[PDB]
Design a protein around this ligand. Sequence first.
Ligand code: NA
Length: 211
Amino acid sequence: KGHLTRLGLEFFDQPAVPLARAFLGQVLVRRLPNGTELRGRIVETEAYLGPEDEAAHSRGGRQTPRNRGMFMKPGTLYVYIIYGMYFCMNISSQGDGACVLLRALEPLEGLETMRQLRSTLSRVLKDRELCSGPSKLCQALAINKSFDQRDLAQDEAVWLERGPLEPSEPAVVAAARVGVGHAGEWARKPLRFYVRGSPWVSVVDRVAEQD
DNA sequence: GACATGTTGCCT
DNA sequence: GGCAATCATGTCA
Ligand code: NA
């Protein structure tokens, strides 16, 4: 572990699909103002191909003030507000307009602070409820629009770390993305990836699992 | 401007 | 499953 050991920019410079899959198993680290560090192992991701992808904010190569991050160098964060109250953390991948979306993390360190963050934002929250969602994880790790357009490879507040080796590569399920019905043909492209059997994924795809 | 629309969690 | 919530943001003009 350690900031010094964060994945560099040669890691993020890959096409959306390979990048999205390569993210699985890595560890997202967040350093809080009090110095505490929050860690979550990435278990769910989504690829957004860009220009072509009709689900991507960059369909038609349309670059707007909001999505600049997607057109910035790989590793560039793109955090946007959805439903006027939630955040979505994306990492720009190779290809102007392409990026990866984080949908779920396996809480590894700072669970209480995450619980605190998620609860304040009754009924007590269980760990399964901390980062099991694109917007849940953003609240749990105190990620917001202020992180938009920063560099995941060079930032003192957030970085990615190599996950542990693992004596059997994790089985990955490729499924349709969540909440992209408005994308016609692209709505069903298997551009969503997660760790098979993981109890931290936000949405399972029984069908996709038996494919 | 005027108008349309993109996750979480309560509801029965 | 159905749906309210809450509003930033993009398009049209
Ligand atoms: Na990109």
